[PDB]
Design a protein around this nucleic acid. Sequence first.
RNA 1: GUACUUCUCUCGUACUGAAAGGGAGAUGCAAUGCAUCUGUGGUGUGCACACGUCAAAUCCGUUUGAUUUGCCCAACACC
RNA 2: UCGAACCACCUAGUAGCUGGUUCACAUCGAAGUUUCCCUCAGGAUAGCUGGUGCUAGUAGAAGUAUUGUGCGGUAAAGCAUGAUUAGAGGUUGGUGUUAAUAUCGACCUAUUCUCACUUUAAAUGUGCAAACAAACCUGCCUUAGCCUGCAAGGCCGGAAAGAAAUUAGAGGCACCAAGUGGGCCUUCUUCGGUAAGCGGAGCAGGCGAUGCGGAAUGAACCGCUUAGGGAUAUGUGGCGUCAAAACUUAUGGGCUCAUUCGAUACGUGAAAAGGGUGUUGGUGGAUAACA
RNA 3: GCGGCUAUCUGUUACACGACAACGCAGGUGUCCUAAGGCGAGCUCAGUGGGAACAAUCUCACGUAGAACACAAGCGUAAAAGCUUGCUUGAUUAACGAUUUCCAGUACGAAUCGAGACUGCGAAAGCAAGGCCAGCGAUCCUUUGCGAUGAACAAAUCAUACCAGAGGUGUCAGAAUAAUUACCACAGGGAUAACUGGCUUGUGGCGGCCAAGCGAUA
RNA 4: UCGAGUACGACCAUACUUGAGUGAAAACACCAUAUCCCGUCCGAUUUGUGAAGUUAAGCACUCAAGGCUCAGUUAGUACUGAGGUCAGUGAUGACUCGGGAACCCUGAGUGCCGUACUC
Lengths: 65, 126, 149, 86, 195
Amino acid sequence: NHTNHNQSSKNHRNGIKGPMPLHLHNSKRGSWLPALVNARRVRKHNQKAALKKRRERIAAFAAKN
Amino acid sequence: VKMNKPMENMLRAVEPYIAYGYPSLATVRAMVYKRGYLKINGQRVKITDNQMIKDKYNNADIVCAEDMVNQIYTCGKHFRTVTHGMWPFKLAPPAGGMRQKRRHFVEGGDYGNRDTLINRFLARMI
Amino acid sequence: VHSYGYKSGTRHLFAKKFRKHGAPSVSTILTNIKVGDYVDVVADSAVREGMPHKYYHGRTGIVWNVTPRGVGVIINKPVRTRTLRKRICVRFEHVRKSRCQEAFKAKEHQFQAYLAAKKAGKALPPLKKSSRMGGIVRPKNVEVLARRV
Amino acid sequence: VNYPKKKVMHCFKVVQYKAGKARLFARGKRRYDRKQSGYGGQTKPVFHKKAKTTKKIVLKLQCSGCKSIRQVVLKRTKHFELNDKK
Amino acid sequence: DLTGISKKSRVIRHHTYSTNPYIKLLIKLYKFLAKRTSSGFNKVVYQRLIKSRSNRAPISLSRIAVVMKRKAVFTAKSKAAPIAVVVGDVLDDVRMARIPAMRVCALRFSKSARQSIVAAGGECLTFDQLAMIAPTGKNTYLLRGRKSGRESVRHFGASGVPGSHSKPYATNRGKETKRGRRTGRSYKRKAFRHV
RNA sequence: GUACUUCUCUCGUACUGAAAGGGAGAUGCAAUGCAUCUGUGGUGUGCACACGUCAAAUCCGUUUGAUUUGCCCAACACC
RNA sequence: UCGAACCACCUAGUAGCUGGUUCACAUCGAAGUUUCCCUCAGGAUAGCUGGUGCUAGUAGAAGUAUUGUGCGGUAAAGCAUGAUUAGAGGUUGGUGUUAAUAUCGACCUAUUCUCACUUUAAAUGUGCAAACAAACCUGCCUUAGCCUGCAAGGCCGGAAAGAAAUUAGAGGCACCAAGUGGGCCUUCUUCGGUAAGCGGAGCAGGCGAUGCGGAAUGAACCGCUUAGGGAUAUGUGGCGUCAAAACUUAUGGGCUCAUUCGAUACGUGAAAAGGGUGUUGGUGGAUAACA
RNA sequence: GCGGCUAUCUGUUACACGACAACGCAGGUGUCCUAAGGCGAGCUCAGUGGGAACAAUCUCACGUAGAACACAAGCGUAAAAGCUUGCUUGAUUAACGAUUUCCAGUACGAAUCGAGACUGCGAAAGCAAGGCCAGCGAUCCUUUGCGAUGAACAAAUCAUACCAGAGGUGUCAGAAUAAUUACCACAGGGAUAACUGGCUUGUGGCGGCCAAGCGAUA
RNA sequence: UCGAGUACGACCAUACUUGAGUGAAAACACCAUAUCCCGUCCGAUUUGUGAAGUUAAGCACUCAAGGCUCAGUUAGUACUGAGGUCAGUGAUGACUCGGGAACCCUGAGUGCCGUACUC
Ligand SMILES: [Mg+2]
Ligand SMILES: [Mg+2]
Ligand SMILES: [Mg+2]
Ligand SMILES: [Mg+2]
Ligand SMILES: [Mg+2]
Ligand SMILES: [Mg+2]
Ligand SMILES: [Mg+2]
Ligand SMILES: [Mg+2]
Ligand SMILES: [Mg+2]
Ligand SMILES: [Mg+2]
Ligand SMILES: [Mg+2]
Ligand SMILES: [Mg+2]
Ligand SMILES: [Mg+2]
Ligand SMILES: [Mg+2]
Ligand SMILES: [Mg+2]
Ligand SMILES: [Mg+2]
């Protein structure tokens, strides 16, 4: 006995939770490789840069302090 | 409540439940003075002195009680502030009674819009 | 529950409109999509290779993926007590670049360019005027109304 | 259905896999020889109800280059011949 | 008066279910301070005491060292060494040989973590002894300590759902790696799925 | 009953493979070498920073930088 | 004691089945639905719900509107795919006729009649977006794209503010665990049936799980939803007695006589045409004479 | 209870997102194709309106699909997706990566977007990992393909293992199955019949006005 | 030399298709030919190769009808969301608070623009 009655009011008790925003689980994975294989190598460099930018900081913040 | 385009359609949709109209100046302060309560720190604190007002609104313009009225009587610039800073006016049922409650105000009952005739309806409730 | 196939109850839904059939546009082939813009997933027939399921027809959503000839679109789906960000894979012809933001794309483009004109800019050219107020209106034709039968 | 005796491959002799040797000394039959041995019922189920009449076709693309037989598997066809396009 | 506001009530843990008579002293200490002070610290350090024992995860001296080295790299280089407060308890770390002379304030220390500090050159404090030094908690670096990677939190999930790298409740580790956890057993639990 | 106990075992600090088996520090130069401490970004308590703000007076609510603890998301490395 | 005796034992056999299951108050509080099951008197799984929470949370808020922006093919409509067809008469068959004639079908026409198939054709809907990186002024790096720079990705600092309403009754996850998995009624519409207090659905509301107030009476209707009291005032329903209230209103406008008048909805429907030479109302059209 | 359908497909049901039930209606499926696959080119179908020794076909008109597309139906397509021809095996391996539908957001099945080869057809851009969307199958076992172990060592067989498929569970998320009981027994069930209480007002049987006329009514 | 001329197009009938009119330069167009690649059973189609020629078709320009597009009605009509201890009849009917058509008919007009060249 199919009814669908009380179901729309069950889905709205604890609320129909809104979707997660885009900054949640934005895993550009399973997508088109030639993009993510480039958006990978550019992440490696931008991490060598993030590590390098902190290296001068501390060393500038040492001598210049 | 304002009567913007977005707002007055929220009244259109629930008219069997509500009974609105346009408040006279004499009925706006009668609400605020006899039945006005504020949201001090999440509580329904009666408006007993003007000192209770400025501490709650703080908004450089809203000092006294006749000043909340002028913000409410006109659409105001601080209207989402003066109203939202207040509790809904828990009121008494109108003396003398209501004609009906199931039929519109124009069909002998009483709900929906009663332009400026809600004063004769709020007077019996304040 | 005899039939619940991938294309069920969809006679009028995938049917082309009246007097507009045949091949897809050259605009729809010359569109340009990025990862991130919005797209109306309006599954048209007459391509019949890459149409999404019925559900994702009036639906618009982010492009999370642009393959060579398949746009990947996330779409919010209110399943039962939560929405899934579905990840559909369709071809480009089933996709419009969604206007849904010209409402403020074109607003803040001239709204700021005049707020700047109003804040600093160069000058403040007067803009659209007031709408709802009073007025001593002068009539131009009197009338009455009783009946018409 | 028909199928060609020969397929060209760039990466060829077709045999139409029909195995079924059914060895003794298979670990699941040694068990069975032990397990259905002696008393008790027929100590195992047996497919009694009817079947899918049509049978799926494994097809062994044995390269004419010596070694490394491939296996492709076609769809369920009732009649299968290797007539090779007369 | 229809509300709908029936489930908006959050469970805040008003008090502690602990029976330790030396933490009910720290709690009355840090109700006084957390209430009759404008300290953001004392507020925060009070909810972390009344908090349970599984929620006050321990920070190893390794974690304390590294994050106090990430503070002390950007300071006046002669200003002061802030106090590493942890409302859990401090555990030694045999992966950190050399430990700085850092002051630490924990509800507890390992016997090997207290000696590792005191041998290093720092002095481990208490909270009746930190209410004497910065009771408002100026210059104090408050710390939790990892509670992920905990074996309880990585059973949380289903483990048979696509994209669920949780651990099934199974004593026999070589029991459940068969059908359902193999690509060649008619389905493999899909290691990835967008959520 | 209480008190003591080396010895051992047990769980786990390391996982993985069907198995033979194998087995996770980071950074710079390299494509292994040498100093050998969050691994990256992001969201991010508390405090210190200066930043003004009706502010009784000036301590705090505002906030912006610093480090960001836990947590989470993303994608590095490694087994 | 017999379609398998009797005693003892296995044995406290098993039972998705029936019956029962012992104190108080407080805080909250449902479900009869999803999928799977030799499944449909049961389970498992989600949902509903509680407890414990963790967490920076006027936000990643909304059963709401606005604004833009998409979507759709039901109602109504309209008859090309079809009709359905006879009414006006005139190529193709047979035929009743004296190369002259029809005759009905097919056709030929202007149509016609009223239907499912037609059309971006509603209302109601629903998808999205809407202010501190969504636009700029800039500058990185690998350059993937394309022949220095555009555009692109991962970034970024300099700078940016609003002259989409409301509530802004705090967002986010997480864990553990029940109960439920026989619903029923109802509004709106509507599939099947002669019909139903019928079966099957969609929507929302209820009842279940819930009193109170009154429709005499009733799980569901109408009000209202519920801690213990007092007062003031209402709701629905009423004011001749029962029965509180017009102590039978100074009631006002007409109507009504009914030899079973009539009189509170939904109870189920109360009465269907039909007429008159009947009592009251209205419009067409004479005479200035009715009997 | 026989009878018939549980796994599936289209329309309809179905109410302009989606969802939505009935031994609910209408139909289909458990296949068939080495081409009915792929591609390129050439062409334009059903019908009709007239024309030629023979007498169809060559003629040219007008022809929005009234045809065809392996089939059910519905969408869809006209310098094609149909027709004819050509050359072909992309109907293959796919590192399978992700997704969709069913959904519990689990399989499965079928699809969609990809990547890597190797390719075919094209001058090329592009097109193709079957014929769109129904046509299908877990654990174990058997079986073949594919190239570590048998634990005192060594060798060859033998077995097993990993890997990918096949043999299949139509009750189609997958027990290995005939009756009869009126001699029947038990647990229960008004979840469910005979019964009984109702309800259903059409059947079966009664009645009214109006009668072509019967005989306008005896 | 100026509007348009070809060829490329974007919207896709206001552009369609009809009976004609119209074509002044060019430019398309039919046109000549089997002397080659070519594949035509065919010099039809196309595909070698050019100019005796021709506006006969084609094509763009003009009017001027179905159809199409825009509107005036149609019509606040049908229909519809919501609300009645509304009225009867279990037929929808009106009301109130809103949304609001279509077919038709009377109209309006019957394409527009965008890159290069060429004049
Ligand atoms: Mg009343
Ligand atoms: Mg760990
Ligand atoms: Mg940071
Ligand atoms: Mg209709
Ligand atoms: Mg909504
Ligand atoms: Mg009630
Ligand atoms: Mg009654
Ligand atoms: Mg009283
Ligand atoms: Mg009277
Ligand atoms: Mg078919
Ligand atoms: Mg067909
Ligand atoms: Mg194709
Ligand atoms: Mg399925
Ligand atoms: Mg699959
Ligand atoms: Mg198929
Ligand atoms: Mg194809």
